[model samples]
Target: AQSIDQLIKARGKVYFGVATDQNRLTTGKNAAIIKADFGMVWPENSMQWDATEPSQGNFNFAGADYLVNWAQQNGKLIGGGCLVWHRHLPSWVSSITDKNTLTNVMKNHITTLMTRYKGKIRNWDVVGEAFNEDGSLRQTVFLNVIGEDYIPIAFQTARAADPNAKLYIMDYNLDSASYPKTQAIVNRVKQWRAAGVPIDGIGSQTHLSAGQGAGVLQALPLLASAGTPEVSILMLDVAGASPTDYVNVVNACLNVQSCVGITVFGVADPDSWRASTTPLLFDGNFNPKPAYNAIVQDLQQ
Candidate 1:
């Protein structure tokens, strides 16, 4: 009965995690699967801003609270999602006009959330999707108002608030072989390192389709050099694919020297972001899909 988490550790790597939804937690089958097998559990939508702070100064974190408590009780690592992202912006957050107010607002939000979940969150995606496809800084509300200083400021603010959690800037479309967006982020990390920034890791979320599994793994050398503890998360969301589709990407990550861990975007097909399709380790019934056993077998190696 070697678990996925145990077998992954036996191979001398970090956590093998999955993005777990609230719906899955309500079921005994799904709960047992995650608690017994995975090393880390990232709250799917709970940690996102929309769920935490739907309005301006008024904050409610019922979703995040539940996940953190569950992780603590289960002795699992907490993979906290974004403190700031371009999407899921609340009406109040998106309506900010003045520069000083916006900066204060961003800092206050990060400070509030990170301080509350400080020591509990093992990994935090301080800023998400800050880079465009061509490597330019994304024109986000924070970026437009705060300029590029927003990135450093967000990291600095999170560090001051947490002081212990591993700070990460997670992004999508980053697994491309020749994508300058990936290169730019790495160079930015390098610059931050030289400037004494407390950035700890880079979280590249690989959401490849059916035929593009190796697209990101080929760029591992570039991303591995991004930070001290670079982490790559793979997403296999092809509507009609085999268990081997995911296993191929998982093996690519496992084979890499610097990939600290791989986290699937979701667990059960019905609960995934792509709810219309089967795109995760478990089926609609929470049964282990062939995809689940495939990775389990790979981890046993």
Candidate 2:
């Protein structure tokens, strides 16, 4: 019980998690480390639009099911990522130009996944990376066809489909307190709440370069100021993260009351999306890196 998850739990701060895909799940050593160390697991890609509903009106869950089943069997809490995003979007969805059709399609995609997974997944990234660098909404097909109301509609539909699971709007680059996108998300969260939207949390995908972690200290509280019930440091990947970067990021989470958890983008460097950058807690051989030891040390305190 001296694992990272146990250490973080002992402090009663937040859950410690990692993002992974099916390939790593089948690796014996990798899977063992995940089961032992992580309190939660977020599917890296299996639940996204291209993977889940690639064809119009047709759905496939084989990949997603395998991961969810693994999480259950291993007794790890599940985090469902990205019911909505711009990248990995299928041609059918991106090609849709009709407002009513796009809205219905968005609802159906969310409803189908939420209704099926329901309580199995503890939270849903109701939407992902919906903003431009300047803090304006990204011009995806959903935005173009369904307009700004699409965001509220998504959170509302997700709440209807799975009331228990926390609903989050996830994005990257919010680690900087002064980033325009960060301010934009904060403003939108207040507006959504004032307008009666069902938004529950914010997911800041802290995919940063090494030595760039200082700003996170201020960013986390700024995000919580919107009055959301929770905020998550989702998909944290500091490329070539030093021990200090790891500890600082963990401390940033610990410092913020609304910060609920931190999910490293991947378990092992080789399996990370930014693999060349070595953005993970473990090395290719499944050995915990210095970064891992440092965060563990931080949690123990």
Candidate 3:
């Protein structure tokens, strides 16, 4: 109750939460924190391929199901994630240097899962990182087996299953101005859209340090152009140097017209911390920290 109330009082419309195990919804007090303050829920990594389907031809949707159900019951929007199919394949599947089996398994798994949660999913990270900095496919399990076409196939399959769900190709370190790899991704997205692929947005996972604004600004035009259909900036798993660092990212997002929203990683600090810690708002005990107070102050701006 207190957590939910905090969310409501915070004017937080989108809540970002995560599920570690299959059944555990909240991590200690984090659940209460989100329920009270957020309206939209995005599982940090629960819905990712590895966590969802560890074994080949077998999927464990218990964790994702709990998250989706909780969000639906609470009337919050739910975003599905980490659907790259490369991360969660069984050891046997990954070991198969055969490209045919790889392509078959990826296509089958994606189609099956997307079909299962078609209408229920609000948004999806249809294709996670598939390219390196130079426009080449990462030698990931998927790319090695399925080739470059795997990306478009994944997006198409997702659209086939849930036509209404927004599709995002999510990645980190791709939000810099001079990053050729980031530019390559933007170009590919444009090409895919032209070819009638069902990509909706690009998720810029802003895991940055304090002074990375120049790099972010430099990549805005490429990002903006990639949003040919529609776009939204998702600040997923954001950890910064301080509250000021948090505000810098928020302000950067606001500068980009395509940036629709931001989601802070945790409302409270992690149980453990190093000097490099960048908790958004609260301490480990759930007490408000300087950064937390700073964020609240900036939100008022």
Candidate 4:
């Protein structure tokens, strides 16, 4: 049987991936679905600061290693997700008041992770959700102490740590070209390009509700025009999503040349962060939902 990923590749698309984690690995069903259909495997949490480096200079890659090794063994592309984010940050790192200490700490964190997973991970979310809805920099330890420069600093450090891997700034509300947050991201990317910051791509997380698929279609070209070579649509979750909804999102990517890939938040509805809603292509029983067939049919072209 031709898998969905094979169909995507047959059409020359970069990848169609899923956000997976250690807990999802516990089930053979979860692993099976991911291995069969996903071209890329993005760890949902195992690579986060709290999960990897809970204590100062104390690194644990057990969970992250498990996922990375599995992805490599399966011949799947790996994405180092959210290397820097405000939430899921360890208190020790977040509570630091000294600018110099925090700067060194952030650099060390990025360097260690990128260096360890150098060739294995193809891309990393160097920074995630760095802006507020109002288009201002979010108030976080990185910003409060390190100021606005933290964004470029993170990308630069990641580039030096691993020159081959693409670094991305992932964020929500980037599903629309007109949204304030999306504009802020565009402006920043423009600024970074002029300054030679070595930034590569944008991970526009389309965590949308019903009837918001058009915004995703509109956003792709606008994001690409920001001077980045790639624009991946991430976390494409729609509560109670219909087959048309899934097709709309998929077609959105298909319409934009720069929209290289699309990653749903999870494999199945039951595994979703928003579990109560049917937001994924697969159902709780691991059967391909209507949305799954819809995407497959679309991709088969």
Candidate 5:
């Protein structure tokens, strides 16, 4: 069987994705860790509004620029910030009672970032979870201030700033059997596309536990069929309590042609970072475990 890296390289273009907490890509063991294995890097927390623009009208790009430059210099791809997460909002912006101001702020922030990184960023999670499981709006600052249309506005702004960039609407529990939120987002995207809005992709954040069900697999084709653009199977943190669980998730991605690739959360054991969960792949000494080999073997196939 081919090695994981070899398999990825042969797959036309596969993204070995990782999330880093660091502001910049400083050279050292950590930098080596990312550069050696990953073909693309995502920020774990940085680049969000709180991280990038903690104060209204004030922006920070020092840390973000470092990652962007590192990716460009190393010939790797970069997935821009997790822009739409509610936690990333600055307190001032989130507290605004006026709807118009809030909507304008959201639109401006997205446009600025997209314009700045127009050619560099390959993909962006432009609109995250904006609705609940039942298709009702999630009680978020954006929803409360800007309303439901903020999602499409965000996508439109991103497209205006970087027309060539691939736009992805991301959400959790999209793989849940009973979640109508997924369908809601799909319907919105279809409407946006039909209305001449620029949308390029959908990111199904598969943060599932083991034995969640075969329902996600069954739902893949249905979701894939809903998009006018390509659907990207973004499997984050595929590691779980059961080997079968993680494998099932991986298999589901493989089964879907729209699932361009899968990103295992971390390449090394979580213990190395003093994490609480069981390591996804390697052990403390960076040794590959049985589970790691199993994952590698699966990728080889």
Candidate 6:
């Protein structure tokens, strides 16, 4: 039995986190596994707009409070809920007919969410999925309401709420041959940083197996983002991957100098978002799998 967090600490570098949800904390046995295995926790959904402010000006923190309080007590880094995402919006959010009111609502959501958890969260996904696959900006409700200004405005508002927390702009689909989306988001980050936005790191999703990371090399020098790749151990397992395969993935992250940490979607397969597929380092019974052993070996060495 090895602690991944311990192994990572021994590296004198990097962090390891898990995406924890309300179900895992309350209904599943993953709470203990999370505390023992991960150094940080990303709430799977509690901090999003729907949970924060389902309707309008009415704000609620019940969804996020349990995880925030638990993380604090357990000495784990609490990765804040998403600040802005083009998807998963409450129906009310999209119906805003006025652009100015929509912009105010977004900033309000950011400030209130960040302020309530101010010093508790270590970092936040300030902006999520703002670009299309073809490298063009996605035309979401925010875009319709405030243009691309919603990106920086969300980050700026979060800064006002918690200056100490690291802010990130997240995007998926980076493992492809040509990184048009990667190039596009990098340009946006560059423009914002130049305009004095305190943007941190870029969070990207990849289709490549654990044996990857070079796909993001071009975007690395662009923005000063924090965190690292999150492997779907469940997906790897579903594919019948070998321990060596998992080892290669950890190595991919290890090979990158900019990678400060790596996050897994879950601690156990049943704890995964796609529980039907069993994608995690621990099996349904919470037993560590070959991938877990591989990661421990990689970090220990």
Q: Say which candidate scores most in lDDT.
A: 2
Candidate 5 regions with alpha-carbon error over 4 angstroms: 1-5, 23-29, 239-241, 271-274
How well is each residue in 11-52 modelled by candidate 5, as lDDT tens digits? 543665666645325522556656666677776566788878
Over 15-47, each residue of candidate 1 has an lDDT whose tens digit, in order, gives 878777666688747788888878888877887
Q: Where does model 3 exceed 4 Å of error?
A: 1-27, 233-240, 271-276
Q: Report model 5's TM-score to 2 decimal places.
A: 0.87
All candidates in order of lDDT, best leading: 2, 4, 1, 6, 5, 3
Write down the RMSD of candidate 3 (Cα, Å): 3.7
Whole-model lDDT values for every prediction: 0.77, 0.87, 0.64, 0.85, 0.68, 0.70
Tens-place lDDT per residue, model 4, 1-301, is 4577788777778899888888887875988888888899898889999998999998999889999888878889999967778989999988899888999999999999889987778779999988899898899999999887888788899999999998888889887878888888899899987998877888888887878877777887788889887888888788887888778888887887877788889888887878788888888788888878888888886
| All candidates: TM-score | 0.92, 0.97, 0.83, 0.97, 0.87, 0.88
**Candidate 1 — which residues are off by over 4 angstroms?**
234-241
Q: Write the per-residue lDDT of candidate 2 for residues 138-241, one digit (tens) a residue.
A: 99889999999999899999999999999998898898889899999999999999999988899898888988788899988999999999998888888886
- Model 5 CA lDDT for position 275: 39
Clashes of 3: 10
The CA-based lDDT of model 5 is what? 0.68
Show where candidate 4 strays beyond 4 Å. none
Better of 4 and 6 by lDDT: 4
